[PDB]
Amino acid sequence: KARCSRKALHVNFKDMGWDDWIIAPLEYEAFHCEGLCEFPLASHLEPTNHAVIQTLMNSMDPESTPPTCCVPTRLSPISILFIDSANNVVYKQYEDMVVESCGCR
Amino acid sequence: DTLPFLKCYCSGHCPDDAINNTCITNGHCFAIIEEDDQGETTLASGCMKYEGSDFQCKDSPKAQLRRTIECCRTNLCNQYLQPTLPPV
Secondary structure (H helix, E strand, C coil), X not given: CCEXXXXXXXXXXXXXXXXXXXXXXXXXXXXXXXXXXXXXXXXXXXXXXXXXXXXXXXXXXXXXXXXXXXXXXXXXXXXXEECCCCCCCEEEEEEEEEEEEEEXX | CXXXXXXXXXXXXXXXXXXXXXXXXXXXEEEEXXXXXXXXXXXXXXXXXXXXXXXXXXXXCCCCCCEEEEEECCCCCXXXXXXXXXXX
């Protein structure tokens, strides 16, 4: 049973076809969240009361109530230097780029 | 009330950062026995966040798989915990 957790996800701007317009970085690690959210939901999964209720109900009748979902619950920024502006250079900090933690919601 | 600090044993439900098979939290330690398809059972244990714990620690008699969870509120209280299934 592989339970909800942070997995590696490497973003490379060239593979995305974005090397024409992003100057830096070339690549970063964004991570992603994947895995079962089953009864019981341990502490690092930090469930809402709703996620607890729904999980319980899904545990009782999975035909009638689907599982809650493993998703990012804490993230951090990445700053990107790019062009795109009729090629006027620009520096921008983007929030919520890198998963720091996952949980069931 | 929330617990500034609680240390619990874990197995199956350990955070990625678990040391000595233990986890930290503000709610409860739990131990759970649950019954598999051929009627095989596992025990597992870990940490439970305070918020949601009053719901998780009581148990729905209507779970599709028979199980028993127990919660307590003191360090390492779940090590050595043996809940048994509800009587058939």
